[PDB]
Design a protein around this ligand. Structure first.
Ligand SMILES: [Zn+2]
Length: 369
């Protein structure tokens, strides 16, 4: 009587199975999304200022941030900016003003300048104007641009009555990464020092994002973004180069991340009307997950048969971050995602209590709605 996995796997596996089943009907939605995105890119490429715009995840017009919202897509439009000088905003480590190494009108971004600073406000404004005008050239399909909520999901489109596409504009820089990332990406004992060096030769991105305090915000800051690196690591994630390419090396890392995301999504959905959980996002869960991979670098610590314990360990790490109010950005270690300035103690304790209940009760929230 050999078990297929150690106890606790089956319920989690049935959850995973159900989540994938929700993706077996996508090709359609994906199609409409690709059509819209390609149209937009064509129009934006005609503007002198956005002439270099392109898909970040090359050949990928989809990237679901919410494991349980298959009709919600996330795409990033990146634009190379030949030579920027970053200036860190008030030692925040993650937020910067964007300035330029030279002055005249050869970079078509001069129109977005405010003094010497590149205005995220102005650029976003043009981006949105171009997009709205373009989705209006769509005659037999109601593509609606949703109203502003912020800067970095820049634009949300509602296609028909079922599909949404969040479009993020990002500046791309091919300079070496800012000094605040110097001690981050601590993958040396997991994915290797040579991999870390290789990754850090890739460009980095900047997305418009107000850096706000308790008081208010400086409207023209940009936040560092490494979503391309996160994707690369998640899909090439083992110490072994052949991790998950055969039966002997099947690991549960990806499934643990999916389960953490689903847990957070289910709880946020249950409590959405009372904003207790508004400030938590899949990005916190993904960041915590990468730290757990650093803490457990060997593939044998993620054997698929041990899904139950691996997931429990993920939950436990996330709880520890909540209780101690510390979750370091994986690329920028002095940027604390769970500081009291960003998320009130009360919200963290609330989430802690919900997750602890779930974990003590075999995760009934996975089944409830
Ligand atoms: Zn693997």
């Amino acid at each position: 009587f050999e078990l297929d996995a150690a106890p606790g796997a089956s319920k989690l596996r049935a959850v995973l199975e159900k989540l994938k089943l929700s993706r077996d009907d996508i090709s359609t939605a994906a199609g409409m999304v690709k059509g819209v995105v390609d149209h937009l890119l064509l129009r934006l490429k005609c503007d002198s200022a956005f002439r270099g715009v392109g898909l970040l995840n090359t050949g990928s017009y989809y990237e679901h941030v919410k494991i349980s919202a298959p009709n919600e897509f996330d795409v990033m439009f990146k634009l190379e900016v030949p030579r920027i000088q970053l200036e860190e905003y008030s030692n925040t480590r993650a937020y910067y003003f964007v300035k330029f190494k030279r002055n005249p009108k050869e970079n078509p971004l001069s129109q977005f300048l405010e003094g010497e600073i590149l205005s995220a406000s102005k650029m976003l404004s043009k981006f949105r104007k171009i997009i709205k005008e373009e989705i209006n050239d769509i005659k037999d399909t109601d593509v609606i641009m949703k109203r502003k909520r912020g800067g970095s999901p820049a634009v949300t489109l509602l296609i028909s009555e079922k599909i949404s596409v969040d479009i993020t504009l990002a500046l791309e820089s091919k300079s070496s990464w800012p000094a605040s990332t110097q001690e981050g990406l601590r993958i040396q004992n997991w994915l290797s020092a040579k991999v870390r060096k290789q990754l850090r030769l890739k460009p980095f991105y900047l997305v418009p994002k107000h850096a706000k305090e308790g008081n208010g915000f400086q409207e023209e800051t940009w936040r560092l973004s490494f979503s391309h690196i996160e994707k690369e690591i998640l899909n090439n994630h083992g110490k072994s180069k052949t991790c998950c390419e055969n039966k002997e090396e099947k690991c549960c890392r990806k499934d643990c991340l999916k389960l953490m995301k689903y847990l957070l999504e289910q709880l946020k959905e249950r409590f959405k009307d009372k904003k207790h959980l508004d400030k938590f996002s899949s990005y916190h869960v993904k960041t915590a997950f990468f730290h757990v991979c650093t803490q457990n670098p060997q593939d044998s610590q993620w054997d698929r048969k041990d899904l139950g314990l691996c997931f429990d360990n993920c939950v436990t790490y996330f709880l520890q971050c909540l209780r101690t109010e510390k979750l370091e950005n994986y690329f920028i270690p002095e940027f604390n995602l769970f500081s009291s300035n960003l998320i009130d103690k009360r919200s963290k304790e609330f989430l802690t209590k919900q997750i602890e209940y779930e974990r003590n009760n075999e995760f009934p929230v996975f089944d409830e709605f």
